[PDB]
């Protein structure tokens with residue numbers, strides 16, 4: 001695992017998230033489910049907890065976007081960069097953006113929303129890219145049935161937030 005410079009870490013254990021918009025690619029319930037599942041991946045192995053907001057600024061603002069979208073890092077069309085997320089902190093920090101020029105799917109027929117979300121949330125929590133090819137934080141993620149957080153990812157996230165309480 002790799003942890004970001006000067007260890008930007010959330011100073012608190014409870015984080016809020018907000019799904020700002022929805023992709024035409026999928027039913028809204030599929031987007032919500034994929035996000036909830038992605039958050040659970042990290043919650044299960046740390047003391048972190050999450051709750052959802054429908055207004056105001058949540059810690060983790062989640063949105064779909066294309067090309068120029070209000071930050072200095074425009075998306076690049078179909079393929080290549082699939083999404084991006086900012087390290088812990090206020091405002092844009094912690095936020096996650098998903099490139100709608102990808103075809104988001106609940107399975108592996110396009111770009112799997114759950115898997116990419118899980119990876120990006122890793123960034124939102126302070127993890128950087130792993131060298132372990134089997135890690136969720138390896139740049140190169142993609143049998144969803146056989147998905148399992150790697151010990152490397154668990155080691156990395158616990159180095160920041162510790163193991164579950166009890």
Ligand SMILES: [Ca+2]
Pocket residue numbers: 075076077078079080081082099101102
């Ligand atoms: Ca792209």
Ligand SMILES: [Ca+2]
Pocket residue numbers: 058059060061089090091092093094095
């Ligand atoms: Ca934020």
Ligand SMILES: [Ca+2]
Pocket residue numbers: 023024025099100101102103104
């Ligand atoms: Ca799309």
Ligand SMILES: [Zn+2]
Pocket residue numbers: 065069071073084097
């Ligand atoms: Zn962006």
Ligand SMILES: [Zn+2]
Pocket residue numbers: 119123129137139
């Ligand atoms: Zn990444």
